[PDB]
Write a protein that binds this ligand. Structure first.
Ligand code: MG
Ligand code: MG
Lengths: 251, 233, 251, 233
């Protein structure tokens, strides 16, 4: 029973259901596994290859948990609706959203800016979050949470040719605050502001060296913070945009 | 008059804060090209006041979310006055209060376009014509820092994007061009605030023209709070 | 063995040693117990009554852990030296410092300010942290961490008559950043910025009501964040000042 | 000259940034009481320049960490000029680079006193004499926002305290008195920065006098970055 108490305490998300978008990428898959490790049911969106999503589902099921994956474009209203509908049909509720959909898309200077590029960056980073939050609200429970993935770029403008990306992440940071007020006390809303993370998805040695921690971050680093913020261990934290950048920027 | 010989574009010059910026710029000697969206009354009377005092200005109606109107304003500015020394972009607005639960894409996009896309379009259009030592001033909001008021989540998001973009462009466009924005609180366009009043368009214009001027040559990438002490950053 | 794996994973601070100052107060005692719950040895400073420190030590020992308590004034160089000396003599190392010493002392307006009051507030909140960090540095290991207790007051100036308190907490916030750079990569340094917390020590209904979470925070809320930041789960977070204020302020 | 008839105290007016603030204030018509710590050469020549242009100023040597010297400066200001309309506190400094591992209480306290306690003493001394619509300008630093440079942890801490105190006093002292501070980056008293140069004392003085003036009437509790785009807030 010393065990049973340990298991009970460790599995604090047992009985709860999470949606992770962008299980598509490294940070997303790490978040999926971190949520499941504490007992959450997980519905996994991915955009392109299903390889990492399928294997995450299989790992979760082998450990006695429950998950499924679904391809979709989170900039599309129909795909957003389908993901949430299938999540509720399968699990009956939604307790947390971790939205890892996003991206730089391309490096484009303002002098060469096109509306197509600007709109595409806004939609994948910001509109996708708007759509998912809207879709989830009818289903979220007392004590629910939303975790967004912003960036250090929201705080410093971003890197060369990334001005659209920075803008979209700054918008997400502000929206996190607006929604924390609009949706509390029922729902908490927080976002992460990662620095340089070593992933398939993002795009160097400089920055690792210049950083106080002398390394790039990992997807697992980010997942630990995401799940902390999603959990009841962060019950008095809402509207926060938490820097996870190895000491490269302070706020 | 340190802006003598210099050329300013003010968008949203109809137009409480915009109109105040127009007059402050002209008072320091700038030629001013004025955009307004709808009624011309305030823009036209500003032009008449400026001309009566020996200055130069014109007013042109246009929608700053439209590429053709953005191009027309900058083209006329360059033909009448020459190169652009400063852009003060006062186009923006909440449009309507709507909760996230009932958000539509149409509304979201509209708020993004009037507050943010319009700024992108104007900066892009101005860049080839901007002088050495020129500047851009954006109009953000306290809402960028605190998320905004009830039903204003889209508006807050658009202003937060503008704040970050200010930083991004300060790096991309320096040293040739400085980029700063203002973060106004409650403007009268109260006694909970330390200053115990609402701000005025003139308060905001004074900060805008300071940031536009050479007196702010070592300030770039700033988002300056002008909110009567209601919020600190 | 499914147990043993669970125990191994849950006790991530096993073999490590923490110093908590201000086990004296609610937040401090909660931090003590949260650290011990994950396996840390804990050395506990308290200023006045030993009641809560003694009972924490007894609870930890009953659960198979190790801790001791020691009265001391963390504004005094001799007491600071004695605490660290006794910690190292007992446990052989120091892996984390959680510094909960601090306080408003009294409400004093600037017009009525005295150097005595100003100095007293600076010393209990800021100088005490300087002394403890300095004392710990010869003993800290690869992968060590420091957690300070700042305040929402550092970000907004604080409440009526609390201008000295706010100043001391803003200093601590900045110092957190300076030390994250000076001491990394060996040591991470982060602080918490709590809003309204329901404790013996702090000093109301307004603020609870006005807050997005519609309540005051608890000592346990703060302890969860403190131990997250002290742990390897925050390995890519340094120089952060994390808001835990129920959504009353955003940064 | 909008500061005609108004009285300013500048501490640290010896004194690169301080001296520049003195001249900028006098150029807009202010009477200026000038503190300097040691050599009088820069303060005295500023007084002579101001007087030669028909203005009014005096210079008084004193240590702004000492209660008696703080009292003497404010007393003489009130006797010669009357009530205080603005305080620009430029007293401060790094003193020395020292790592935390080798920190002494003496050094820590010295840095706190010259940067922070001095400001506390001057504000307290000025309060009974400050006018309706008066202002305080502190000199913080980029170091308050990023922790400061190598061996400067004490200096950063003292400037971070000043930034927060600015907010606290903006609330406590409003609406009668506005309180703002400056957060300068590298001042020449570089090509990594967006503006590709170091700042000048004059850059800082222009911002200081803006914040001291009625042109900043709706700005209080601000800590304004003036760092050439090296840091954003
Ligand atoms: Mg020039
Ligand atoms: Mg007045």
């Amino acid at each position: 029973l010393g065990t049973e108490n340990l298991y009970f305490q460790s599995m604090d998300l047992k009985g709860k259901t999470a949606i992770v978008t962008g299980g598509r990428g490294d940070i997303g898959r790490a978040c999926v596994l971190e949520l499941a490790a504490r007992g959450a049911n997980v519905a996994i969106n991915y955009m392109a290859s299903s390889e990492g999503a399928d294997s995450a589902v299989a790992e979760i099921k082998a450990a006695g948990g429950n998950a499924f994956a679904l391809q979709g474009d989170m900039t599309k209203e129909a795909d957003v609706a389908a993901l949430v509908e299938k999540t509720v049909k399968e699990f009956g509720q939604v307790d947390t959203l971790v939205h890892v959909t996003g991206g730089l898309i391309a490096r484009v200077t303002m002098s060469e800016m096109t509306l197509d590029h600007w709109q595409s960056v806004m939609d994948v980073n910001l509109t996708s979050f708007v759509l998912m939050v809207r879709e989830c609200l009818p289903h979220m429970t007392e004590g629910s949470s939303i975790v967004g993935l912003a960036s250090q770029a929201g705080r410093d403008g971003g890197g060369p040719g990334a001005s659209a990306y920075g803008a979209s992440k700054g918008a997400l940071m502000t929206l996190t605050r607006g929604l924390a007020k609009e949706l509390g006390p029922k729902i908490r809303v927080n976002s992460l502001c990662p620095g340089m993370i070593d992933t398939d998805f993002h795009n160097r040695t400089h920055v690792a060296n210049v950083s106080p921690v002398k390394r790039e971050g990992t997807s697992e680093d980010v997942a630990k913070l995401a799940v902390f913020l999603a959990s009841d261990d962060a019950a008095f934290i809402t509207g926060a945009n938490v820097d996870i950048n190895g000491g490269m920027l302070f706020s």
